[model samples]
Target: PVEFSRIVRDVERLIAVEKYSLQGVVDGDKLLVVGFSEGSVNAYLYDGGETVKLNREPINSVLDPHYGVGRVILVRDVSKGAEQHALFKVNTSRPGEEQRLEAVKPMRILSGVDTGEAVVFTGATEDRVALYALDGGGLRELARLPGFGFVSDIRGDLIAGLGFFGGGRVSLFTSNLSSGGLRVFDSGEGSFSSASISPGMKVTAGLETAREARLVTVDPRDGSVEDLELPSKDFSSYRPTAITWLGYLPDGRLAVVARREGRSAVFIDGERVEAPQGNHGRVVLWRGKLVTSHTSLSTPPRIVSLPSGEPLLEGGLPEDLRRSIAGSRLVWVESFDGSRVPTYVLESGRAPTPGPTVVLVAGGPFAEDSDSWDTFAASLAAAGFHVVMPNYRGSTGYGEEWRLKIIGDPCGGELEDVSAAARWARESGLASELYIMGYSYGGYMTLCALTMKPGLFKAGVAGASVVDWEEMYELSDAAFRNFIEQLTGGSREIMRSRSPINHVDRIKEPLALIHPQNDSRTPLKPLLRLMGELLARGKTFEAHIIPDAGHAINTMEDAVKILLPAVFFLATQRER
Candidate 1:
């Protein structure tokens, strides 16, 4: 059972550092626990071992009684037709009694739900907040933010989080669901994706601008604002991939888990405490314990746990994981536009020498870091290739200004980030022939780099890549349409200009394109159209259409099969 233990191992990896959502609902001595993924949701009375599968789809959030796991409320993101829908009020008391759950009835979208004086769920449409009475009848619209991008909810009366569109500007809002009005807190330049609530009715927003963010705390109660204090001398200068607020400590102070760079740290009342930095983003803390979703440069993800307030390993990994990993050295290289990005040169005792450099470009829309590219880099390193993954300017670990630097100006500036990494790979002796590969959004980057920098890369492999931004304008799934609306500022021209297919004539290297037919994010047509045009013009290229795969190639089996062919095509196929 290496798989199960490995899963438990990764779960243990988080015990000492972060906390996770929906693990266990503490109702006095009874722990009602639940686990979920993209495909299913299961609830278990862990101590009692009474577990049941609640849904075939994914569970977005769970709300339990104040007394802990008494009456539970579950929300499901169930899709219907060309539109998205949600199932709320799913009751799971009688585990084996199928259909025991009452549907709030499926809607076009279901973003969030909770129980308080009024239980509210936010939908994707202009319909805004759907409110349910304390007695529970049907859901109705309580209030609406004229233009809402994203929604998040918590206990009590306040509706907290951020929403924005076009460019990277963010405007934090606190909605009064009862009165159907929004109390605006802060809205200006920069993007704020995540936020958390603290005592004194304060809401802190994580700014993607300038290194995670300096910090902006505003009282949702009154809109009063101020800066939060730093925990210790060792403050994170980088932006975090994830963050969480552990309710007041025993001393009635806030415990925050902020993830930045490779590791996540626990801060007690704004003071730095030791923690782990895994290949995955570990950013959860609950009941004085840390639960993290752990991944490494070479491993798939598994959730782990660790004691609270403990220090991370020297290199920010668990001791056992560190011991098992083949050691590697670190080197910093300036990217195409002169931004210095870190590249890990991994080896297994054999001294590094000239080898085919596999330049790993991350799935956008963020910069390179331990969380995203770490595992892939390690896997490639284990396979004995000189792996190079760089975080371009648009990457998240940087501040908002840097992350959004290429907002309306994609292809030009960000493409340089990949090109710079290739140039660095050549200069650093990592490779004589450069090969490029990326997943999802990164796939788009791989194509653009090949198109933008004609002779720089020897060959290119794009998996589930985005080829045409304009086509994406209509073909994109609901989630991505929201993303594009914000990224392109609703400009069709901006989308068309940055599309690699729109500028495909520049591509000169051998290319391999793989995309999932069921992919809602970027769809399969763009790649198919690109291949068709290339073939019609007597250009040589390689292509594969995954049968049931979505926007992502998803499984390791598919990745291995398709990726091997793609790599072979780029390496051995003749180019016209």
Candidate 2:
């Protein structure tokens, strides 16, 4: 029998989904899922009637889940490019009409009141945290946390921040804004990682204390301590992807979610019944069912359901990947001071026909993150190219030291990891020709890689790349300037030395400079300045200006016109 392999053509990223019940409702009659950033909102009912696109921009976060509270909340702001996020209130009764949801700009509704009477919601200008009233009034500001932390729903009277922190700090806090008191308390710590939240359970908090996790139960009113440690520590064995309070069982054991070990375990009476593997995001418990998404680096994310007690991996790849390469080899590249970096390689499958290799890198956003190479990487692999994605030292999720390593020193150490990934691909028979492409900060890496190691790559695609390191000093928004200063120490010489545009002449092969007209993250002035230099030297290259777009390109026409051609250019390159 021929081997049946799953080749991913499209890897969808699901920001949020909701199920009707935690146990009582059948899945066929319960489901309302929303996906964002693909230029529209995709909505669906459990039984399957139709999937609708509510808007063009991505839906930022889900404001209300009245049916049953779970860790799942809707969102679309993954790319960080969208400034204004659309918030939604999910309803399943009227599937098409009012059930579709009313889309409102951010800050429309504040804290929801469990107390019956109506009061206006107060939120911050930054949209960090807020207190809302019973009426659908905007929120009032309670407190603002650090970074891009999101404040979902206040549990009962206590407002919570269920996101990650700078250190391996996995903590949750509740504010005391009631007339009884006015103080914010460190409610509890969680073992759950970032984006993992339990919005309903006001008394229980899973916080990470001292790198070890502690499941603390606190007073919802005063944030006073209850039980800081649980009797069991088995949860510490694996990481927590997401958490939620699933309500109480007839026997009195509270049903809650403990997502870990690549599966969602239902904790009834504090006992675990494992569900399914959710590699990409968390599995949510709603109504009475568990819904989670299956995702990989090169495939689109899809939602699956596991009734009260169902096996994991119940859902197969819904959308098949095009006939391209499958799987990859993961290896570590040693960095400075005994640190290590991870490299993911997508090799060409056909025997004796090695393809060009593209080393994709990440420039910014939480130090080092794997770029959105899944879309473009799979696209390239489909076109017979080997692609490698590296999680270099400075990338996020590694810890504070890794995240803050090259803060003020942009191109110095990060590019070393990029070079190492390319060198490995060449030695491992992954490619005949090496190329590079990076988005945003990865774009910054692409320019630096090409300049620092001019002869290594045949071509480079710096998409929406930051050419001038210090231009951000002047061109960046006030908040961004402070952020850059924090990272780079506001040094002009360091900024210039690290910028790719400063070394434009070092680009030997045909390079494609792709960026939107209004890219607030990476302003166009640096690209234009590089264009002047490239033009002065009469270098062979391609340039595109996406009109009326910001930081990211929107239309398919633009992708085809710009990206496809750039791929063809890099794929067919040869040293002259």
Candidate 3:
């Protein structure tokens, strides 16, 4: 009898394990962090070896709180999975109590920062993407951005942000705090990755070109850019592939977080600082110590002290579960076009030499699969399956050229890269048989593989997938419509030809779909149409549509509902 593995219990624990993120520095290094605890995410005040919970329910995020601020801004999603968020305020002194800031209407809150005196954020409603602020007078609009915009930093009267208003490249935009005016600066060099306003009123940004990443300061006044070199730190010497984050410390020192490959390094005033392995979030100066949120494949996100890499606070994994992840390594697989695809392999401690493996694709064709703690990957590994994650063409962390390869050609080259990963797993004797599983964009890849390259995997799991881009575009908001057009090169043919729903008749493998019914990004309507096509064609398929949930999951119940089905489905196939 093929009983359901301890996968459910394991997922319950995995989802319940509290993960911490370094949100901001307040009260001179008293760290304000957002933590997932008790299967719910909330803001926390970590000080004096004690943590204080701030919100009553799971919050989407906390606005970057300014130093010495006594309160924190909490953003929560009210529209289930639609990403429509409402803002609230939690005083540092009063932990579980909150006050709703009804001044700002419910919308998609992208990014924001709070300076005690004012709260500035970028939001997208049904009509437009705009920047807003709330202070003494009232909530007011700062400026309207063309596409997706994020408020990166606010210093004095100057504000810096990155937006996708230009063609497809990200441009740095500057505006006044009280006097609302917008100034956009586009570089001939490349797109701006990270931005921070210096104490000198200059916008210091991470410039990512075709090959590498470097630091540059953009003069918002005159649109002039110059290489920004720290007194002791030559950032270019480190040759970072991407600048994860850059900001100015309260003491007027520059702090940066840069990464290459899957790991990150910390730099302070041009001097490289020691940090733990894997990726680190933003850098924060606390009591003269550098603090960051650190994570690896085997570890959940935790606050760690820099230079020594000692754990400040962390969520411990059960010994048995920790051992299940035997080891992980990075490898390059040769693809169909001779392109070297960067892949990460998680060897399962419980699996055999020739084991049943899952080629787990990642969401965000824009996102990269790096040395990070992923609950899905960890849960899959716990089920005695080796995991393969490929950094296909469109993934970041590689150069811009590689990341831009999928801009015009969606499923073409990237799908080839995924196929090559499966072949490598087979030829390398890591898998006796392979299964495909992915969420969001990864789900799109699963459908693409099952339809475009059948017989490659025994079965597949697709969650929150984009079935038809044209239909999705029609149902999308202003921000998403622009992104869809940009990704498809504004060509209707490309959008039509690349969609996986258009080729359901070619599928030969059984598929399981998991989706949030109210998902705003990749809405549920297209998935319904896809199910209709699958049913008409008599294809073997199962669908689980979660009610009142969206793409961004905050609660553990929602996480379990979306994840458990896929694991159980794959485990059933493995038994077969």
Instruction: Give the per-residue lDDT digits (tens) of candidate 1, residues 208-245.
Output: 44555545676876677666666653445434544532
**Superposition TM-score, candidate 3 onto the true structure:** 0.98
The reply for model 2, stretches above 4 Å from the true place, is 1-29, 36-39, 45-82, 85-139, 144-147, 162-234, 239-278, 307-322, 350-354, 362-364, 367-373, 490-493, 552-562, 574-576
Question: Model 3 misses residue 109 by how many Å?
Answer: 0.6
CA shift of 44, model 1, Å: 6.5
RMSD (Cα, Å) for all candidates, in order, is: 6.5, 7.1, 1.3
Question: Which candidate leads the pack in lDDT?
Answer: 3
Q: Report the error of model 1 at residue 434, Å.
A: 1.6
Q: Where is the poorest 10-residue window by lDDT in model 3?
A: 1-10
Q: Model 2's lDDT to the true fold? A: 0.50
Error of 2 at 457 (Å): 1.7
* Per-model TM-score on C-alpha atoms: 0.76, 0.71, 0.98
Candidate order by TM-score, highest to lowest? 3, 1, 2
Query: Whole-model lDDT for model 1 versus the true structure?
Result: 0.54
In model 1, where is the ten-residue run with the lowest total lDDT?
14-23
Pairwise TM-score winner, candidates 1 and 2: 1
lDDT for each residue of candidate 2 in 357-405, tens digit (9 for 90 to 100) = 7887644645333312255676666555677887764554443345445
